[PDB]
Design a protein around this ligand. Structure first.
Ligand SMILES: [Cl-]
Ligand SMILES: [Cl-]
Lengths: 405, 405
C-alpha cells in the first residue's frame, strides 16, 4: 500500500507557507515538486563527483560518464525500450518534439503530405508541426474533440490517407486528463505507413508506460514533471528510425571527424543527437527521480491518485455553478470554471488561501477555443496530495462563489 | 588581493581523492568545479521555492518568475549588455551558436555568400556554420594560424569581401589560450556590413567582458565553465538584430496566439527564442555563479591566474622534451605534448598521480591538424589552482619522461 504521509515527508517544499497560510500545491501538471532524494543526488554529484563527460580519460570524467549512461539505461528500462541506445537526452518534451520535427520531419514529409495532430494538443505538440508544414508545404490535420473531452475517433477515416506521414498525439491531456487509446490509434496509423510520435509528458508519472507494447515510433516526456530536475527530458525513437535520422544540433560530441577541407562526419545514434556538454546535473537528478518513482511503484501511485481523484470529483459535486471539463475517468488534473467568474480571479482567491492551482490556457489555446472559453482553472492531484487539500479546494470554491456571486 | 586558500574552501570537490591520492583538478577548461554557494542556491530553490515559471498566478510561480528574470538582468550586467532583453537563455555555447545559425543564418546567408571562421575554433563554432553553408549554398572561409597559435591576421583582406555575411570567431582558444583581437576584427567585419558572433566560452571566467565595448553582434558562453551548473548558458544579441530574428524552437511560452485555422503568432524577443519549460534550476545556479565570481572580482581572478600561469610556464622549462603549443601570453590553459609519447598515455600517468588534465583533440580537430598531431595534453590553471599543484604536474611529467623515455 501507499502511505502519502511518508511520501510527503520526502518533499521539503510541501512544508512551505504561502501568504501566511500552509501551501496546498495543486499544480504538479505544470511542474512537479522534487524529493530531497532527487535534490541531494544532483547536489552530491556536484559536491563530490563533478567532471566533464565523454571526452577525457581521468577518473572523475570516466566515473561521471558511467553515471550518465547508466541513467540512459535506467530510463530505457523505465519506459521498456528495447535498447538504451534508443533514448536521446533533450531539454524536455518541447525540444524532443522539435528535434523529431526537424531531423525526421524535414526528410520524410514532402509537399502535399499531411500530418495529423489533435485539437487537445499542448503547444509543444502543435507549433513544431506547423513550422514543419510551412517549411515543406504539407497540411496539418486535426482530430476534433467531443464535448466530454475525448477524441472524435470516427473522423480518422477522413484524416488518414496514403499521404499521411505522421500522427502526433498526446498520451494524456495536460488539461482534461483524457487518456487516448494509443495502442489502437498506432495500429491504424501504421496500416497507412505513418509513424506516431506520442507526447507522454503527462503520462509517465501516473502509471507504467511500455513503448514496445504501444509500438510508438517516438515518445517524449520531461524530467521536471516526473518529480525531477528542470532542463532534462527523454526522447525515445525506434532503433531503425533513429539510425536513419540526420543530426539536428551540430557541434562537439556528435562528430566522428571535423575537417575544414573535407567536411564533417557524424557519430552513431543516440550520441549524434546530443551536441555540446550535456546537462549532467539534470541527468543525475532525472536518474534519482526514476529511482524514487520506481521505489514507490507506479501501480501504487496510480491507485492512490485514482482514489484521490474520485474523492475530489465526489466532493466538488457540492460546489455551486462549478463547470468541469473533460471525461469522468480523467487522470491527474481537474479542469474547471466557477460560474461566470474568470479563472484568473478564481485562481487569485485560491492562491490567497494558499492553494496553488493553474489558470489560463495551459498552452492549449485550441482546446480553450473548442470549449468557447478563454481560460480555465486546473487543479492537479498528484501522489503527494491529500484529502485534506481537496477539502480546502472545495471550501475555497464555495467561499469564492458566496463572496463573488 | 586574492586568497586562493579561502576560495578553495568554497569548493567541496577539491577535497576529493582520486586513485588513493589527493585530486589536482587541472581541467576546468572542459568544465569547472562549482562552489557550494552555487550548488546550495539551486538546492535551496528546489527545496523551498520551486514552481513552474511565467504562466500561472500563484505565489511560488510569481516568485520563481521574478528570480528567473532577475538572473537575466544580472547576466546582462555581467557582460555589460545595454538591455537584459538582449539575452536569451540556452543550454550552453553550442545551442546558442545553433540558434543563431538557424534563426539568423537561414534568413541572412544566401547562396554565393561566405562566412569566415578560424582554424582554432571549437567544433561548436564550426559544425553549425558547415550545416548552414550546406543548407544555403555558401562558402565557409578560414582564418589560418601562425606557428605561435595566433591568427594570420594578414589573410583577412583576401577572406573579407562584399559577400561576407558573418564572422564567427573565438574570444579565447579552449586549446592554446590565445586571445584574439576582437575589437579590431569586429571593426573590420563591420566595414563590410558583416556581423560578428563571438564564442566567449573561455573568456567570461578569466577577465571582465563588455559586449558594448566589443560591439559584437552575438556573444555566447556556458554556465558550467563559469563555476556554474550544467544545462544553462547565455546568448547575447544586439536588440536590433534580435527583434528581426524568427523563432527557432516552437512550442509553449514563445507564442502570442495558437490557432489551428488561422496559424500562430510569436511573442516579442528574448521570450520568442525560449520554448517550453526553462531550466529554472540551472538559471538560479548560473545566477549564484555570477554573484560568486563578481564577489571575488574578475580583475583579482585575472591577476591570480596570470601569476600562476607565469609560475607554471617557468617551472615547465625544467621538463625534458616538453613541447608547448600556443602563445606566450596564453590565458587559462597550457597545451603540451611530452616527447614522442602519446597524450592519452601521458594523461593516464597524470591521472594515476591524481592529476586531472585533458587529453585528445579538445573538440578542435582542425587545430590538431594544423600542428600535425592527433592529440595534445591540456592543463587548466584556474582561480582555485595552486603553485603546489603546478609542482605536481611538473614532477609528474619528469617522472613520466624518466619512466617512458
Ligand atoms: Cl567533438
Ligand atoms: Cl503558450
Amino acid at each position: 500500500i501507499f502511505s502519502v504521509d511518508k511520501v510527503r515527508a520526502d518533499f521539503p517544499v510541501l512544508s512551505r507557507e504561502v501568504n501566511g497560510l500552509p501551501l496546498a500545491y495543486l499544480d504538479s501538471a505544470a511542474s512537479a515538486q522534487k524529493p530531497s532524494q532527487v535534490i541531494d543526488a544532483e547536489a552530491e554529484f556536484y559536491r563530490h563527483g563533478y567532471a566533464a563527460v565523454h571526452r577525457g580519460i581521468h577518473t572523475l570524467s570516466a566515473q561521471a560518464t558511467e553515471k550518465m549512461e547508466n541513467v540512459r539505461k535506467r530510463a530505457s528500462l523505465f519506459i521498456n525500450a528495447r535498447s538504451a541506445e534508443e533514448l536521446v537526452f533533450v531539454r524536455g518534451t518541447t525540444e524532443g518534439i522539435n528535434l523529431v520535427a526537424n531531423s525526421w520531419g524535414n526528410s520524410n514529409v514532402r509537399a502535399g503530405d499531411n500530418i495529423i495532430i489533435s485539437q487537445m494538443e499542448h503547444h509543444a505538440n502543435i507549433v513544431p508541426w506547423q513550422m514543419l508544414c510551412a517549411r515543406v508545404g504539407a497540411e496539418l490535420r486535426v482530430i476534433p474533440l467531443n464535448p466530454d473531452g475525448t477524441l472524435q475517433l470516427e473522423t480518422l477515416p477522413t484524416l488518414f490517407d496514403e499521404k499521411t506521414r505522421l500522427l502526433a498525439i498526446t498520451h494524456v491531456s495536460n488539461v482534461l486528463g483524457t487518456e487516448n487509446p494509443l495502442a489502437e490509434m498506432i495500429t491504424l496509423a501504421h496500416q497507412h505507413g505513418a509513424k506516431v510520435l506520442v507526447d507522454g509528458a503527462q503520462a509517465v508519472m501516473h502509471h507504467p508506460v511500455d513503448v514496445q507494447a504501444l509500438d510508438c515510433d517516438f515518445y517524449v516526456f520531461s524530467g521536471h514533471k516526473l518529480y525531477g530536475p528542470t532542463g532534462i527530458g527523454i526522447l525515445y525513437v525506434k532503433e531503425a528510425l533513429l539510425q536513419e535520422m540526420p543530426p539536428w544540433e551540430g557541434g562537439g560530441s556528435m562528430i566522428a571527424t571535423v575537417s575544414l577541407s573535407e567536411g564533417t562526419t557524424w557519430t552513431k545514434a543516440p550520441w549524434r543527437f546530443e551536441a555540446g556538454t550535456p546537462n549532467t546535473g539534470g541527468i543525475i537528478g532525472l536518474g534519482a527521480a526514476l529511482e524514487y518513482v520506481s521505489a514507490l511503484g507506479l501501480n501504487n501511485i496510480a491507485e492512490y491518485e485514482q482514489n484521490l481523484m474520485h474523492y475530489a470529483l465526489s466532493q466538488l459535486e457540492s460546489v455551486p455553478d462549478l463547470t468541469l471539463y473533460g471525461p469522468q475517468n480523467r487522470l491527474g488534473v481537474i479542469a474547471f470554471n466557477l460560474g461566470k467568474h474568470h479563472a484568473y480571479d478564481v485562481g487569485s482567491f485560491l492562491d490567497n488561501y494558499g492553494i496553488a492551482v493553474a489558470t489560463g490556457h495551459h498552452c492549449a489555446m485550441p482546446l480553450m477555443a473548442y470549449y468557447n472559453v478563454p481560460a480555465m482553472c486546473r487543479a492537479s492531484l498528484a501522489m503527494y496530495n491529500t484529502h485534506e487539500e481537496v477539502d480546502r479546494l472545495v471550501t475555497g470554491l464555495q467561499r469564492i462563489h458566496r463572496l463573488l456571486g
